[PDB]
Design a protein around this ligand. Structure first.
Ligand SMILES: NC(=O)c1ccc[n+]([C@@H]2O[C@H](COP(=O)([O-])OP(=O)(O)OC[C@H]3O[C@@H](n4cnc5c(N)ncnc54)[C@H](OP(=O)(O)O)[C@@H]3O)[C@@H](O)[C@H]2O)c1
Ligand SMILES: C[C@H](CCC(=O)O)[C@H]1CC[C@H]2[C@@H]3[C@@H](O)C[C@@H]4C[C@H](O)CC[C@]4(C)[C@H]3CC[C@]12C
Length: 320
């Protein structure tokens, strides 16, 4: 083995390069199973999935298949799952995590997150709706939610807990919670050169919270979720230039950029050639001039605004 990891604030270790597993429904789930295997093989020791991804069955079957193989040991696979907004209510966390575990056929997750800050009505429908297309939000003290997460960490069902799509205010809320037992080990948020959340990153760094970047390569750009008019990240001029100078690719520089920033990156790809290519971030380095060059690409280009959840006071994206 031997791969690059970072020490999480709870003593655990997380690999710096994580493999994303979400894909549009237009893609069959089988693809997720075959893709993960290819990722394990390529060098990925960190796998990121979720309940809402509706692919834990395949993703688990994969990682479970590579352990049976003798290709990897469970202690070398860092699997992340996320609690979905229709289960923020206290008595609903553990059951949710248990449901995932059941679909994965694993005895615990290495990392478990609160997927999104705004709550929705409990029930099967992942995104409930009024007979008038209205999203049925719900109100839950996230601190109560976080208390159930802590009990999961203690029950040994989750090795490390953390948040996703949390902003400064929200992050603080958990941090300053009365009787907090475990500060979130990380905060997984969108983060690429056209939106290198310095402000948030610094904050996180100052609290020893690792920032896990997603859509680090510009995202899947799925029609309903991402604005087609947004600039295509991997087409950026200076990223392609640097790609050449280094004899690598714009994607690899977006990935390597993140790494040197002290960030943990996720790169999703079902294409074998590309999957194997992403594991190359470890093959080269960027110099201070380039380090700064990419810092300069900053813009306010947020790909996933998930504004269909814009209502509630917990919508994360309208502050920093
Ligand atoms: N917590 C959250 O709120 C949240 C939100 C969004 C995503 N995530 C996580 O982050 C992961 C990242 O997925 P994403 O859709 O956001 O964006 P991404 O990782 O930026 O990837 C978008 C696309 O880039 C392509 N790609 C990968 N490697 C490439 C390479 N070397 N050269 C050229 N293209 C390459 C992929 O196409 P191919 O697959 O065709 O290669 C991919 O569809 C997800 O799978 C998920 O696990 C978490
Ligand atoms: C919350 C996340 C965004 C962030 C992330 O990826 O972490 C989004 C990304 C894709 C979305 C699903 C969509 O493809 C298919 C379907 C559409 C229905 O109208 C509602 C149900 C489904 C299953 C959506 C649920 C919400 C998902 C999982």
């Amino acid at each position: 083995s031997k791969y690059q990891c970072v020490k999480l604030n709870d003593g655990h270790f997380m690999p710096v390069l994580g493999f994303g597993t979400y894909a549009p429904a237009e893609v069959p789930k089988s693809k997720a199973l075959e893709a993960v295997k290819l990722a394990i093989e390529a060098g990925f020791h960190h796998i990121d999935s979720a309940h809402v991804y509706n692919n834990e069955e395949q993703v688990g079957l994969a990682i479970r298949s590579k352990i049976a193989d003798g290709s990897v040991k469970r202690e070398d696979i860092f699997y992340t799952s996320k609690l979905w907004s229709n289960s923020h209510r206290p008595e609903l966390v553990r059951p949710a995590l248990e449901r995932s575990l059941k679909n994965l056929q694993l005895d615990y997750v290495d990392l478990y997150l609160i997927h999104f800050p705004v709550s929705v009505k409990p029930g099967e429908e992942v995104i409930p709706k009024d007979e008038n297309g209205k999203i049925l939000f719900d109100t839950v003290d996230l601190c109560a939610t976080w208390e159930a997460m802590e009990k999961c960490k203690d029950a040994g069902l989750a090795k490390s807990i953390g948040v996703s799509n949390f902003n400064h205010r929200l992050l603080e809320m958990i941090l300053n919670k009365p009787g907090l037992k475990y500060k979130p080990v990380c905060n997984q948020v969108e983060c690429h050169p056209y939106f290198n959340q310095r402000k948030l990153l610094d904050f996180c760094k100052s609290k020893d919270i690792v920032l896990v970047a997603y859509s680090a390569l510009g995202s899947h750009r799925e029609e309903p979720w991402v604005d087609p008019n947004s600039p295509v990240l991997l087409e950026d001029p200076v990223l392609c230039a640097l790609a050449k100078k280094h004899k690598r690719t714009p994607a690899l520089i977006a990935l390597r950029y993140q790494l040197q920033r002290g960030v943990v990156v996720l790169a999703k790809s079902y294409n074998e050639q590309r999957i194997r290519q992403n594991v190359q971030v470890f093959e080269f380095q960027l110099t201070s001039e380039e380090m700064k060059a990419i810092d300069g690409l900053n813009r306010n280009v947020r790909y996933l605004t998930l504004d269909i959840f814009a209502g509630p006071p917990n919508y994360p994206f309208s502050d920093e």
